[PDB]
Design a protein around this nucleic acid. Structure first.
Length: 327
DNA sequence: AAAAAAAAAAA
């Protein structure tokens, strides 16, 4: 059959079993595009992650296949980013400081990661800003280079031991919505590499101090270790339906809300059951905190000026076994 | 069929 000659960097290898047949597929980075190819078990085992290859491909059974490969060999990340590079929705490689990582409250699959980057005004000044990057479990598992994320506990463990550490963000997409909200996005070929600096880059720590979160409007995200009197009531108002929450961080009493809205494709019975399970699990949280059975972190969308529209972005339970439960 | 921030409610 006809053969295709390509060259590209491997990103991940996956095994999917469907209708009692196993398929080994490799995600390769060719010309800054993620292309999925098929292969055999020898391909699955011999090929290594994050390495370029010279591949020959045969088009068999309506599927591009890998026949032979040659292990070849081959980056620079921008230390900043401009407003216009966010406006154009460009694709960049940044140097960011990881801050927090949590599972969006009430979301089954999506996670949110908080970074500190250097934005640049048209005035030509670089300010360390706080940015949010949402993703799913699959992309987040396949994005951390040199880290094997199998289940959710591994993802949270990587998140917690990557906290306040520097990351090269390869081929991330700089979103910009209709309103002036700028976020980060994780594409198929996007990768996240942890530097393990050992504070080798410390003179720049002054630059990585934030006062504005550019993915939100005059709000930031802050992480609190609940040490005291957690409390959560539920209030169904005429329109809204929110958990009114108070708790006690080592510094401040905090008041907050978790707003509940029914999804379009969500039956009222399923929504009501899910919300009552959320309420039951929140009303048991203070009992677990007091008895030293869990340690709770709350990631909070706080307004630095007026604390009257606080919202809990996420909650994470660290259990005494070491397991992480994303409340 | 965008999605995601912002939303004290209720007189």
């Amino acid at each position: 059959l006809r053969t295709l000659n390509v060259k590209g960097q491997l990103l991940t290898k996956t095994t999917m079993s469907i209708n009692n047949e196993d398929y080994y597929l490799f995600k390769f980075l060719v010309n800054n595009k993620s292309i999925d190819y098929y292969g055999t078990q020898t391909q699955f085992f011999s090929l290594i992650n994050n390495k370029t290859y010279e591949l020959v491909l045969q088009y068999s059974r309506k599927k591009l296949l890998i026949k032979s490969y040659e292990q070849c060999e081959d980056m620079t990340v921008c230390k900043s980013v401009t407003f216009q590079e966010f406006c154009a929705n460009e694709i960049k490689s940044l140097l960011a400081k990881f801050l927090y990582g949590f599972k969006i409250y009430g979301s089954s699959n999506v996670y949110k990661l908080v970074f500190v980057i250097l934005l640049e005004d048209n005035n030509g000044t670089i300010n360390g800003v706080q940015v949010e990057m949402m993703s799913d479990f699959k992309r987040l598992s396949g994005a951390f280079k040199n880290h094997v994320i199998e289940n959710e506990n591994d993802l949270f463990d990587c998140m917690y031991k990557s906290e306040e550490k520097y990351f090269n963000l390869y081929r991330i997409k700089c979103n910009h919505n209709a309103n002036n909200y700028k976020s980060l996005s994780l594409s198929s070929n996007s990768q996240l590499e942890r530097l393990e600096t050992d504070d080798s880059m410390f003179e720049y720590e002054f630059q990585y101090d934030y006062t504005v979160n550019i993915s939100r409007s005059n709000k930031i995200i802050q992480k609190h270790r609940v040490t005291g009197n957690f409390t959560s009531e539920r209030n169904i108002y005429q329109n809204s339906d929110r958990f009114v929450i108070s708790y006690d961080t080592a510094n401040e009493k905090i008041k907050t809300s978790i707003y509940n809205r029914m999804e379009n494709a969500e039956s009222k019975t399923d929504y009501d059951t899910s919300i009552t399970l959320k309420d039951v699990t929140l009303s048991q949280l203070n009992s677990l905190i007091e008895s030293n059975l869990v340690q709770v972190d709350v990631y909070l969308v706080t307004d630095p000026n007026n604390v009257k529209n606080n919202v809990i972005a996420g909650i994470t339970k660290i259990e005494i076994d070491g397991t992480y439960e994303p409340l």
